[PDB]
């Protein structure tokens, strides 16, 4: 169970927008830290409506199951606040935000070594979840958070974490599912109960495509009906102009779930591309 945080000790500041049936805010948590020292900590607050009981139960279950698995590349959740008007997940605030924005804002500067490092780190996170047989369900660049920028001056590669899973694709409306083509794999579009570890392999592929496409979203030009038809006709994504990961993207995004490679194999492939 999550550590419970008092309503009183959270201040909501700026809106960072809306996610899938969530409102996101930057905030401050008043806390007694190590050594009984009082702290006021920058936090990310994810807000679910109490009235959507099924959605928040799914949201908070998923967040909890993953938070039981501490890892350097998985986002830290400090706890929850349910004593209020709403249900709130209190999470670490990640200084450089989402990868998808960052890729767009710094497209001109990001090169292949940076891309490789970030792909490697995501692959290691996904390896860890695979070993723990925990399905994330919502891997996309948006949900990669940049803890630390690259510093060439000093040799530091960037560092990333993968955010919490959100509401399960088993409980989300069909209409949201179709909107998330091509991250949601074809087998989950025909039946979301086909959700499986193989799901995350497909989405990982889609995320690599984003990582190589400067913040572009695959198939954004296509409406929901045409996205559905794209899977029905078994299309693949175009190779990015930066083609270095094109083969890995296609191998990952295999219409046969059984044939998608393990994350160990994905890591060895990434390592070899040096
Ligand atoms: N831990 C975090 N630190 C800093 N910024 C964050 C964090 N988590 C999310 N954000 C920012 O909040 C905004 C909304 O995030 P997002 O759309 O992922 O919400 P969400 O509730 O996680 O939805 P979904 O389940 O669709 O991912 C984005 O600008 C993103 O960069
Ligand atoms: Mg998210």
Swiss-Prot record:
Signal sequence region: none
Site features described as Breakpoint for translocation to form PCM1-JAK2 fusion protein, chain residue numbers: 175-176
Subcellular localization: Endomembrane system; Cytoplasm; Nucleus
Sequence positions bearing Phosphotyrosine: 35
Written domain comment of the UniProt record: Possesses 2 protein kinase domains. The second one probably contains the catalytic domain, while the presence of slight differences suggest a different role for protein kinase 1.
Function: Non-receptor tyrosine kinase involved in various processes such as cell growth, development, differentiation or histone modifications. Mediates essential signaling events in both innate and adaptive immunity. In the cytoplasm, plays a pivotal role in signal transduction via its association with type I receptors such as growth hormone (GHR), prolactin (PRLR), leptin (LEPR), erythropoietin (EPOR), thrombopoietin receptor (MPL/TPOR); or type II receptors including IFN-alpha, IFN-beta, IFN-gamma and multiple interleukins.
Protein name: Tyrosine-protein kinase JAK2
Organism: Homo sapiens
């Amino acid at each position: 169970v999550f550590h419970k945080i008092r309503n009183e000790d959270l201040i909501f500041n700026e809106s960072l927008g809306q996610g899938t049936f969530t409102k996101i805010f930057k905030g401050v948590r008043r806390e007694v830290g190590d050594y009984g020292q009082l702290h006021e900590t920058e936090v990310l607050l994810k807000v679910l409506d109490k009235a959507h009981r099924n959605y928040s139960e799914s949201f908070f279950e998923a967040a909890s199951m993953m938070s039981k698995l501490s890892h350097k590349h998985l986002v830290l959740n400090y706890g929850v606040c349910f004593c209020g008007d709403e249900n709130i997940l209190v999470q670490e605030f990640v200084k450089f935000g989402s990868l998808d924005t960052y890729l767009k804002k710094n497209k001109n500067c990001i090169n292949i070594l940076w891309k490789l490092e970030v792909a490697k780190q995501l692959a290691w996170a996904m390896h860890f979840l695979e070993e723990n047989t925990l399905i994330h369900g919502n891997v996309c660049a948006k949900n990669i958070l940049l803890i630390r920028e690259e510093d060439r001056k000093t040799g530091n590669p960037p560092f990333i974490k993968l955010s919490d899973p959100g509401i399960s694709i088993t409980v989300l409306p069909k209409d949201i599912l179709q909107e998330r083509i091509p991250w949601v794999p074809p087998e989950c579009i025909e039946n979301p109960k086909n959700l499986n570890l193989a799901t995350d392999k497909w989405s990982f592929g889609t995320t690599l495509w984003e990582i190589c496409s400067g913040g572009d979203k695959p198939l954004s030009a296509l409406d929901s009906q045409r996205k559905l038809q794209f899977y029905e006709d078994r299309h693949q994504l175009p190779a990015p102009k930066a083609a270095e990961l094109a083969n890995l993207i296609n191998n990952c995004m295999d219409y046969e779930p059984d044939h998608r490679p393990s994350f160990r194999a994905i890591i060895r492939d990434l390592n070899s591309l040096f």
